[PDB]
Structures are given as structure tokens and as C-alpha cells.
Amino acid sequence: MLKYIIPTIMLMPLTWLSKNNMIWVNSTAHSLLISFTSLLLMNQFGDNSLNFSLLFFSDSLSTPLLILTMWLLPLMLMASQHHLSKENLTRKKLFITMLISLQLFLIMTFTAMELILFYILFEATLVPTLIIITRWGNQTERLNAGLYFLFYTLAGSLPLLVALIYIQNTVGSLNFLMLQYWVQPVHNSWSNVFMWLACMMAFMVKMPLYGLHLWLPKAHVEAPIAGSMVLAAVLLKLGGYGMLRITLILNPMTDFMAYPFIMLSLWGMIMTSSICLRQTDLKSLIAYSSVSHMALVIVAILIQTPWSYMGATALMIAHGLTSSMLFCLANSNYERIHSRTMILARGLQTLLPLMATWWLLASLTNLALPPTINLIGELFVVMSTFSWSNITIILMGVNMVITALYSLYMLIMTQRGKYTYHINNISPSFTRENALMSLHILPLLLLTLNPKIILGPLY
Amino acid sequence: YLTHQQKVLRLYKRALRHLESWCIHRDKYRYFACLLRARFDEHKNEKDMVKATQLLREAEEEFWHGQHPQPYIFPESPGGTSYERYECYKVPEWCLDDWHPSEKAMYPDYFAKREQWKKLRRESWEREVKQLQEETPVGGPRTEALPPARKQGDLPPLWWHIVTRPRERPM
Amino acid sequence: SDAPPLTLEGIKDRVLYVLKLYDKIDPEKLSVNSHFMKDLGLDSLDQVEIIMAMEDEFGFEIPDIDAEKLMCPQEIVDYIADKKDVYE
């Protein structure tokens, strides 16, 4: 994949050596060209995947994320230069450099043919992510969130790190393809229980699974517009991709192990969904959208049926496009009313005619408006889940019903009503905003023309 | 609280419509409105305050068992169809300054006349507050009254927002 | 709504006729400055009937307080036009 790796790398020299006032000019154009080249990976085959070298490999499960992944990067640069303008060149380039690195740390993450390699590259991502939030976060009020990251590594990565290394000695190697022929049954024994958790626990923090989700809502309070979009667009999907990946060597032990997760996952949806209503914060509810959505993916993986994995592939792609759009949509107010308060501003339709359109257009996909990909996946989950147990239908039935509530609550609470009288700075929608948003819905809808690509290797 | 006197008037004002709702027909309602009028006339001369307290209490429970489930409502009031039905068509007066010059130049009469609102908004700004400073109770206003201007050709204090509000039917 | 516009002068003659339809209001005692309590001798009970008649004469409901302070036709004229945005 060197063809994709290096062009991103040289963008770092591009930032430093480009015309000081053209840093935004070159970056988008140069980065965008890479996005067009991203398509070439889609040369998929029916049976065998696309394997280049001993390190990098791509397939249907990872292909759409790669194409999706790069797509985000130019948008993050777009959304930021308004408030990065306040920053100076000496410290401004520091913002782009980190983002460029995270692209390298991501594309290689989804193409790592060796799990440790996957783990390594995956681990480093927190450094670009954290430094993006911490140093250049609008809030620096000592939220003390170090506990969560301290907890995460203690219960997550570190046991996972040991877990991986234990496998390599036993089986012989950790190449993902190699396990496809040497994986062995994992009988029910006390030791394997602990291996199973470590092999799964780390991702659950990042999906995030129910009970571990306390950290995500607070992030978007601190993280600026740039950091937020990638967090749910990309970083959350890491866990799903790994879980879909590592689960090749957890049979048949995963069966009984799954239930404790599934109940959290299945029940968590309604709890997480309804909590959306009481979220007074724009970014929190937007964050909560992911919490309930991903829970579907987790269950699809645990039931581990051929049909289910298709839904997660479609669902994983589907949600990321939406929420990433939503952050900017809600953030678009933060750059005007200088806060995340949902209730403070209302009736944006009259003062921003088009903007209410995007809220309408994006909200539908959240509530699974057919035939959008969102329903294609979400519906596929219902089909696969129902076979697992018919009783599961009710939780899906209520959750979807709940989904429409917040799907339209903000669209109502903000796009309608009297304009707040004391508010007098509501400026016309900017070209940057108009174009930037359009980049999201278009491909999200256009994927409906050819959803086949995002059906995972199962299809 | 509204004091004792106001409550009867507010109740008497509200009482008729529900009666009219049940009777409906003008002549029929007019008949029993006079019979209803024949009530509050009897207790018009009541003086003893506690005596007046008990009588009005009955008009609450008594009214509570006469109220129509679907009384007639003027559409442009709460409970009416035309409430919050044209708010969006009203527009802030402060959005003009963001207008592109193409839009602005189309209305030379308007803006030149607007400048006599902003100018009238700022030139009268300093004086009006000083009018309120000495006209404001010490330590915080006791009541929410707004005193008028007290000179020749003086704008009322805090006038801009009320005057500059939209029109009921803008288009 | 086609085009039935209204004028400040027009509301005045409407007010009088509503005040003419009041039996107690003598035609010769009906005038713009005729204070209900004093010039017309109309008390709160009488005034509410007029305001109720006015409410049916303009298709807009007057709140509780806005019917009390109207003790003369001029206030009503100063009141109706302000409500109905009538400028000419």
C-alpha cells in the first residue's frame, strides 16, 4: 500500500515548506487527490482478498474504511481553519502535522496483516488523538480524565498486549491469514476465560460498550471540531474491526461468554437511546448516538452468523458518515453562539434557510430512513438477531421507535421556534460550511446506488 | 394574587364563554347570560371581605362543574388554531446589517430611514439611562414599571426593542 | 385572504357603531373621549360587554388586563390599531 502511505507523509513537508498563506490551499488539494486514488483498493475478488506484501493487506472488511478513512482528513482541515486562524503559523502547523500523522497511523492500522503490528500501530493512535484534544482543546479545566485512560490501559491494552504475545508462542505466528488455517478449538477452561476477556475487553472500551462509555461524552466538550469528527468516524470503528478480526480464534468458547455482553449491548440500547432525550448538551447527545448504534454491531459479531457480519460492515460505514457530519452541524453553532447549548438557540430555519435542510437530510439516516444504507445494516441486524432469539425483536422494536425521538428532537428543538431575541449575530451560512457539509450526505446517499461494496467479504 | 376585586372580573369574563359554548345559540345564550348576569348582580354589593371570600370559592367549584370540554377559542390565542402559526414570518430587525450590498442598494429609502433609528437608538442612549438612574428605586427596582420620558422630545427609556418589533402579518 | 386592509380612521367609526349598538350608550352622548365610567356612565360590567362585542367585531381576543384599562373609546382606538399593526 506504499502508494497510499508515502503521499500522505510528504504532506508533512508540504505544511512546512508551502507558501505560508497557502497552507490551507495545498493541503486540501494535495490531500484530496489522495482521496481519489483511494478507490483503486476496490479491486476486490470473490474468494481471495487483496494481499500485497507480508505486512499490508486489504479486503472487503477493511476496504471501505480505508476509502472512508482518507475522505475525512480534508474535511477535518476544512472545519478547523476558522478557529485555527486564531492560532499563529509557528503553532498552527503543529495542528496539521498531528492530523497528517494520524492518517498514517490509521490506514496502516486497517491493513496490518500481523496482529501485533495491528496492536502496535493501533496503540500509537492515542498519542495523536490525545495531543489533539489536550494541548489544543478549548477546555483545560482539569477534568481529571486520566483515570479512564489509566484504567483503559490497565484493564484494556496491557492485558491485550500480553494476550496477543501468548498466542504467538502457542500457534506459531500471529499473521491474520495464517490463523485462517491453523486456528484451533478453544475448549471451556478457566485460563481461556481470562484470555478471552483480554482479547476482547480493550476494544469494548473503544466501541464503546455499555458501562465503559463514561469517557466518550466528556471528550467532545474538550476536543475541538477536528478531534471530534475522527473520534466517532474512525477511532470507534477500530474496536469493531479488531473484534471482527480477532474473533476468528475464539470459537466455540465465545458462545457462553457472549451473553453478558449481549444483555449489556441489547439492553444498553434502550437505556442509551432514551438518555439521549435528557442530554442537555448537543455534543453529548450526538455522542450518545454512537453509543446505542455500535451496540448493534457488537451483538452481530457475538452471534457470529454469516448474515450478521454484513450488517455490521454496512452499519459501521453507515453511522460514521452520519455522526461525523453531525458534529460539524452542531459545531457550526459553536462557532456562532460560542457554546454547545442546544436549547439556547432555536428556529435556525428562518435565519439559516439551507442549514435546516442538512439537519432534515442527515436526521433521516439516523432514524434509518429507507432505503439508505443505515436501514440496510440496521435492518440486517434485526434479521440476524431475530434468528438468534425471537424475543430480541422487542428490544429492537422499542429501540428503533426511540430512535425517531432524538432523531427529530434536536431537529425540532433547534430548527424551529422563535429566534432568540437577544441573539443578533446569526450570520449567513458560509461557503466553507455549505460545501463541507455537502461532502458528507452526497457519498452517504450515493453509496445507496452501490451498497454492495460495504457488505463485507460475506457478500 | 390580583386582589379580591380582579378575580371576580377575570372569572366573570371567562364564565360567559363557556356558558355560550353549551348554549351556543345567541338568543338562547343571551337569555341565560342575563340569568348568569342575575347572579353576580345579587352579590355586587357584598362588603364583608370574608363573606365575599366564601361566595367566590363556590364560583370555582361551581364553574369547575360547568366548564365545556371544547369551548370556543379565538384562533390567535392559546388554545386557538392560529397560535404560533405565523411566527416564522416575523424576522429580526438586526439581520439587515449582514445584507450583501446588492440586497441593500435595492432599498435606498429604507436604510436612510433606518439610520434615523440607529442614530435615534444611540444619540438618545446616554440620556435615557440617566433618566432611569434617579428614577430607579435605591437598591433595586420595587416594581416592573417603565417610566416615560420627562422632557421635550425625549424617547422613553428602553424603547428600541419594543418599537422595532415585527408586524403581526409581515407578508 | 384577498385584501381587506384596515385604516386608523376606519376603526374609529367601527368603534362608535359597536358603541351605537349599546342600548345604554345614548347616540348624542357617544364620542371619542366619552369615558365609560364618567361620560357614558358605564361600569365594569357594562364595559366588558362592549369589549366582548369588540372581540366579536375584530376577530382577536383581548386579554384580561387589556379589557380593564379600556374605560374610554380612545384607549380602544389607541389599542385596536396598535394590536392590528394599523398605521394608515
Binding site: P353, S429, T431 | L96, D98 | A3
Partner: peptide, 17 residues
Amino acid sequence: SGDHGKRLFIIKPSGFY
């Protein structure tokens, strides 16, 4: 519309952009 003049002003955000 139904009368000479009486053309009411239009207030909106700057749509030129």
C-alpha cells in the same frame, strides 16, 4: 398587491452568499 403601493419590506439573512 390589492392596493397601490402598500408594498411591505422583506427582511431576510444575506442570501447573496
